[PDB]
Design a protein around this ligand. Sequence first.
Ligand SMILES: Nc1ncnc2c1ncn2[C@@H]1O[C@H](COP(=O)(O)OP(=O)(O)NP(=O)(O)O)[C@@H](O)[C@H]1O
Lengths: 350, 17
Amino acid sequence: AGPEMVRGQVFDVGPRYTNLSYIGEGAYGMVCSAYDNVNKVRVAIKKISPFEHQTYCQRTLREIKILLRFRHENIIGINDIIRAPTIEQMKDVYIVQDLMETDLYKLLKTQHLSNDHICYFLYQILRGLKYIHSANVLHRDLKPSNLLLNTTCDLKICDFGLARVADPDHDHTGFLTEYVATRWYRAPEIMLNSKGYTKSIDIWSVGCILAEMLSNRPIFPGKHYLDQLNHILGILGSPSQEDLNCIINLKARNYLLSLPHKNKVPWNRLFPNADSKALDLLDKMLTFNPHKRIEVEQALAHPYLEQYYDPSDEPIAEAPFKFDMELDDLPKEKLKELIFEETARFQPGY
Amino acid sequence: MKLSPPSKSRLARRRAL
Ligand SMILES: Nc1ncnc2c1ncn2[C@@H]1O[C@H](COP(=O)(O)OP(=O)(O)NP(=O)(O)O)[C@@H](O)[C@H]1O
């Protein structure tokens, strides 16, 4: 009897949420399903315990603030948040969301998607990304494990802990050396540069995801950034000097420029069974030069997606997203305060 | 998980009209 424990750790979410079952874990959160005794349906709950780490505090604050503000059919919402009644007592945060049945990472282990499924999932990814980008936000960490899916083929983007307002002058080292579960979906410029990131980094990630839906293998795996870059060069071919002028560190640029020449591999040789229209769009997303990648609006208008194209039903944000202040240089104690404030509206009897 | 055809999805159904 008492607070339920899952896979060793307490999920202090009762009495409202009970009968917990493990779903899975990311690098930061443990996720369970739970029965909501108020609305009489099962929900998802992610427990994070961020407060001893400034970067984990950043993730928690960003994800909560952004997801509470955003409202879109292809983006996961937050319905409730549970945490302690005082800042001193607060060690954990529980984010309650609609329960989705699986994620694309899990599904691709089990099956090869038909072209019809690929097309509709890609449409939804881009429709959701259009909304994100319209708020002047970069997700920065799109990957199969954060594309949530149901049996009805509904897709929702989640996992906004790395999302940032677009700012090409913002110089945030930290990102390059911070642990994440996978780097295989990262654009080349963000494996090397600590500033100048644009929306095109997310288009690169979507390209990687499309390629992986076509083949059920990651397109650019690797043990680390140099190995990954060799995988990229081995498919796209050697970048031109102008392609590589987007790389800031001159010794990194010179290293890349000195590598043995590689020819481009035609997409239909890598993916001989793929829809030619899908490959055309893929080709336009996976360009080394960030400025030359298709952007989200023109991508939605690509012929591959024609059956789903409708600019009258692809909502955008009402305004750019804004953080009150730059989170990067705030101490974890200040971030904890901001998290406490942002979650206050969900306290019982607020 | 067994996926239904995309045409059964609500957003797809809106597009089919
Ligand atoms: N609302 C949800 N419904 C069903 N499954 C979910 C839901 N939210 C998260 N998941 C699953 O839980 C996993 C981890 O969630 P996520 O939000 O990515 O956690 P994280 O540890 O904060 N970040 P990360 O390491 O990038 O995965 C996902 O990959 C999904 O499998």
